[PDB]
């Protein structure tokens, strides 16, 4: 097969700045008719891919001129000028000069906005969940940047590491932030043998953690 | 308007087979080939092959010969992909996509295939309301915890979609053959609890819809 190798894997770029990503092929991809059928697609989070560039350098219908493609031989480049928030997602190069058609491995474009601290909210187990014998404490850490963040759970002031499950959203195309959900799950029995439940969020935006807590004894 | 409409999500046991459909409308069905594309987490995008409805001619990625079979039925304007001898490696989102013209490239909405011996399990939907005695003005964040279901997908909306901004629905995570997902919504304090806030959870695999109104604790 024609192998397409994309670099970098991910690329943080601020709004208004230029992004440049490379696609390298394992062989020449000149079709028998003389054309080089290398394409660039953008797949935004949760959507199907959108075609940006075809035949190396031609802009597809409805694609702005700040997307430009170049290359020949085995080296191809997509340049994105004056990046906008809606440009985030995974960019793929693609070839149909040879069967089987193949995709590159993708390059994730990340919008580098100004740092933002999370809004943190803590939630005790629902009464419904307690009737099934389980107990989940949830902390949402919402609309922050950059993505890296650390959540520490404490039960009665002692750090708890077992039973934590964390999940991050994709980058938001409107405000360029991330959000994450942290769920600490215990049995109902163990939950009712303790008083205080705390999630502490440590983030680049401050040297002190953001602390949200509740006491079962209220 | 060109539309490709794919069949719903599927859970199939290893070793069995599945057939997925892609119904085309809004153009001359025999004029364009339809491709199938595999999107497996961690593995980018992969082209499987295409079928030309005009004459049922097919071109396959050699990797999927003996795995995928494409067929076409012009009288119903539908193409199909059948996958046999399924393994966990076949778990993926599968897209159909119509050969482009000058106006666009036309993708179906995708079909999520899970290959597993684990059992379909409906979700438990838990309301997330602030604890008693805390916070105040001027916004309030609520949520729903959707726990213990299998397989994917689950969809979550808030107030039947009327609440769309300020919503964060978090990707599900699989533990011990059951998924857990959560969704938060942030509204002005003047909205809740004065007006109703309800998370709507749908789990097609178990034929389940749950509405959970968020009530103060």
């Amino acid at each position: 097969d024609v192998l397409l190798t994309q670099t970098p894997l991910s690329l943080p770029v601020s709004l208004g700045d230029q992004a440049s990503i490379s696609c390298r092929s394992s062989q020449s991809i000149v079709h028998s008719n003389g054309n080089t059928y290398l394409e660039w697609y953008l797949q935004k989070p949760g959507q199907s891919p959108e075609l940006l560039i075809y035949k190396v350098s031609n802009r597809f219908y409805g694609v702005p001129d700040r997307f430009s493609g170049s290359g020949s031989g085995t080296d191809f480049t997509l340049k994105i000028s004056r990046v906008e928030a809606e440009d985030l997602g995974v960019y793929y190069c693609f070839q149909d000069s040879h069967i089987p058609y193949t995709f590159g491995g993708g390059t994730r474009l990340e919008i580098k906005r100004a740092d933002a601290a999370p809004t943190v909210s803590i939630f005790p187990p629902s009464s419904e969940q307690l009737t099934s014998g389980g107990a989940s404490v949830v902390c949402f850490l919402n609309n922050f940047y950059p993505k890296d963040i650390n959540v520490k759970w404490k039960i009665d002031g002692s750090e708890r590491q077992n039973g934590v499950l964390n999940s991050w959203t994709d980058q938001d195309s409107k405000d360029s932030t991330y959000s994450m959900s942290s769920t600490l799950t215990l049995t109902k029995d163990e939950y009712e043998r303790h008083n205080s439940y705390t999630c502490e969020a440590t983030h680049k935006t401050s040297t002190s953690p953001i602390v949200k807590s509740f006491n079962r004894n209220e | 308007e060109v539309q490709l409409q794919q069949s719903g999500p599927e859970l199939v046991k290893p070793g069995a087979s599945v057939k997925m459909s892609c119904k085309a409308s809004g153009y001359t069905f025999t004029s364009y080939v339809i491709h199938w594309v595999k999107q497996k987490p961690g593995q980018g995008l992969e082209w499987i092959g295409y079928i030309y409805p005009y004459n049922d001619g097919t071109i396959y990625n050699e990797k999927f010969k003996g795995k995928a079979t494409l067929t076409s039925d012009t009288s119903s304007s539908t193409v199909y992909m059948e996958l046999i001898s399924l393994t966990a490696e076949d778990s993926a989102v599968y897209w159909c996509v119509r050969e482009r013209d000058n106006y666009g490239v036309y993708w179906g909405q995708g079909t999520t295939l899970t290959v597993s011996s684990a059992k379909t399990t409906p979700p438990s939907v838990y309301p997330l309301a602030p604890g008693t005695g805390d916070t105040g003005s001027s916004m309030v964040t609520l949520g729903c915890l959707v726990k213990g279901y299998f397989p994917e997908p689950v969809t979550v909306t808030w107030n039947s979609g009327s609440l769309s901004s300020g919503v964060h629905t978090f990707p599900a995570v699989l533990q011990s053959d059951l998924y857990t997902l959560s969704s938060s919504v942030t509204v002005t304090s003047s909205t809740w609890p004065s007006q109703t806030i309800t998370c709507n959870v749908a789990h097609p695999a178990s034929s389940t819809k749950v509405d959970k109104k968020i009530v103060p604790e």
């Binding site: 079709h31 008719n33 054309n35 059928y37 394409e39 075609l51 075809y54 693609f94 149909d96 000069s97 058609y101 | 080939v33 491709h35 082209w47 295409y50 030309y52 071109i59 996509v97 050969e99 482009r100 490239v105």
Partner: peptide, 5 residues
């Protein structure tokens, strides 16, 4: 000419 995506 390839049948494009």
């Amino acid at each position: 000419s390839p049948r494009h995506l």
